[PDB]
Design a protein around this ligand. Structure first.
Ligand SMILES: O=C(O)CCC(=O)C(=O)O
Ligand SMILES: [Fe+2]
Ligand SMILES: [Fe+2]
Lengths: 378, 377
């Protein structure tokens, strides 16, 4: 329950214990409550910005008195003398006196991992623009699963930029706001089109890594070459469940990535292939064979085992039962969460031409747009 | 020295030990050497991209023979029967058997931390756009020190965008391509007021965080409004040295950040105030009193200590001896590495007018421009 019943303050005033109507208890420290006061002199009413620093809060701050009344908690602090009230709902929702999961390599509860049994989420270009429920569902699919298709879009150059603008902002690079991906498939070219088709995340040599990628089809007359996506979190999960020490090595040591092109682009980054939050949640995958650079940061005594784990992760990524495959017809596109979901394509099986456009955008904007839609539809 | 004298191979063939002319030794594994082969069947001559996957290398790859010859190491791998040569200079530069520092909270070799004892580095607008040496030095100062002033620039709206274009690309956000830093009615952010701002990094509620920020002065004629920058890495170093447990609390638990300053925007992030690499190198600082959200990820029995460490970090950041203070004149600007160097301003009021412009860019582009300038020079 989120309905407060009563409160006791410790003799020290250093914390209080809130009891709810279902019998549950939750303890809150004086300093935390003071810092999180929601009144107009702590949080600006117009923009929600906090108006005080930690330095502004007296170091000896304590709870003087407190009371539960009519679904809310009244708290008065000393030595300031400041009285504030907290809604019951807010206290329960923002509780920290709970059992924090510490499992190393766990995923956020908001994501669902997948393999080849997962259908490609698909949404309509026009519906996502006119119906906020469709837009919400489209962005929610990218949030939960890390990818989604958009179909029935226009066969127009730069349309992918319009897609990005539906939720956020394009990460412009040296290659432009977007780049052309043109392919001529014929008997002569067929050989080299088979090279470098391992699933990968783009640009692990950029820090910060571009967090979303959009690929948009304008023309396709070549047979085969289905797009493939692989869940980096599923691959990492499989490694962890099988080989926790190997998982720990890939998460516990940075790799090196580098792109040094002939057209004056030289990009480098130092980041692990599996990135965890400091409390163990899996937050990002970086995997790209073509731009992996010399691993200079891994101690000698761990290098062999690191390489073994790296190989094993690659085997999960190369596993065909991990890939979700789909065709892209003119006007169709897909987005990947480039911090999680890898992409590639299968081999071409017939001659022809293909024209895709690619760009990057950032997840923060997508989540904001999703948050706003959820509030509007709630 | 990078001159190889002799080599030995382990019984298993799993690694070799290279001895250089100065007496120093460095061990290299067979698998690592094979994966890093520099030849045209492993690395493209055109762009240096890797042509193999990890799966392409035989699992039982081992050194069959290794020899040192005029400054280089020649190695043959079984079972491929592939022979490659590694220059001594390359081996020295890319060694991993170097007893790398494992000091938790250490800074990267390239960065140099600072406090108020060092005057702000300043570069000239006209020089950096015309003279490539001056551009290199300017960008390298930002890379090393996380901060540089650019002075004698034009008093022109949008000039900061031209500045960004000198080295990289603008991170456009909800705030605009660039934003107007001036007092606004119904402000969406306390930046758009006359209030003083505690030293902070921008947008800790944004993941990915903007990695660079440009602030550019058009008018600054009101009393107050001085700029201050604080090296977040120096502040973190001080906490580390004084209070290792406090440092570990701030590095080891996520904080929460949130911005909901108007309708149509709701940004949230879950990141520690001190972000370390997996091996203990400091990567980023996130510190912002105005958009720190309720800390829900810290265990009850650690919350008081966490707040004490947060307070102490704030004390280092508020320390006048840590802040480099200056008042921008029209046409002057500065850039901060927004993952590292915090910025602040004193409040302003009275007759006179203040108008700054701000925008974000990214370090990846800056480093590329710098890398290219160094190669060309
Ligand atoms: O007004 C200033 O000098 C700084 C304002 C600021 O912190 C910002 O716009 O990010
Ligand atoms: Fe790609
Ligand atoms: Fe700021």
């Amino acid at each position: 329950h989120h309905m407060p019943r009563s409160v006791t303050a410790d003799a020290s005033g250093s914390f209080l214990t809130l009891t709810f109507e279902d019998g549950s208890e939750s303890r809150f420290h004086a300093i935390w409550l003071r810092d999180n006061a929601l009144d107009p002199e702590t949080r600006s009413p117009g923009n929600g910005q906090r108006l005080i620093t930690i330095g502004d809060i007296p170091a000896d701050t304590r709870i003087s008195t407190a009371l539960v009344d009519d679904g809310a908690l009244t708290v008065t602090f000393a030595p300031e003398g400041k009285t504030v009230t907290f809604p019951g709902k807010w206290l329960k929702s923002n509780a920290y006196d709970t059992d924090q999961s510490s499992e190393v390599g766990r995923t956020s509860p908001d994501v669902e991992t997948w393999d080849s049994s997962q259908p490609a989420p698909a949404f309509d270009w026009n519906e996502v623009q006119s119906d906020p429920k469709a837009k919400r569902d489209w962005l929610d699919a990218i949030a939960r699963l890390g990818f989604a298709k958009l179909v029935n879009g226009p066969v127009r150059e730069g349309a992918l930029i319009e897609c990005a603008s539906m939720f956020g902002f394009v990460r412009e690079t040296n290659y432009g706001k977007y780049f052309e991906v043109r392919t001529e498939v014929n008997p002569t070219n067929l050989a080299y089109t088979g090279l470098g088709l391992q699933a990968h995340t783009d640009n692990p040599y950029r820090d910060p890594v571009p967090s979303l990628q959009i690929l948009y089809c304008l023309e396709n007359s070549a047979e085969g070459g289905d797009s493939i996506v692989v869940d980096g979190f599923r691959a990492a999960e499989r490694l962890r469940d099988e080989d926790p020490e190997g998982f720990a090595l890939l998460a516990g040591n940075p790799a090196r990535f580098e792109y040094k092109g002939s057209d004056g682009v030289h990009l480098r980054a130092r980041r692990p292939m599996i990135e965890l939050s400091p409390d163990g949640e899996m937050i990002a995958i970086r995997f790209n064979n073509r731009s992996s650079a010399p691993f200079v940061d891994i101690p000698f005594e761990k290098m062999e085992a690191y390489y073994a784990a790296y190989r094993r992760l690659g085997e999960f990524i190369d596993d065909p039962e991990m890939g979700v495959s789909f065709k892209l017809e003119p006007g169709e596109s897909f987005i990947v969460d480039n911090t999680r979901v890898l992409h590639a394509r299968l081999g071409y099986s017939g001659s022809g031409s293909r024209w895709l456009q690619g760009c990057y955008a950032d997840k923060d904007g997508l989540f904001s747009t999703l948050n706003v839609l959820n509030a509007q539809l709630g």
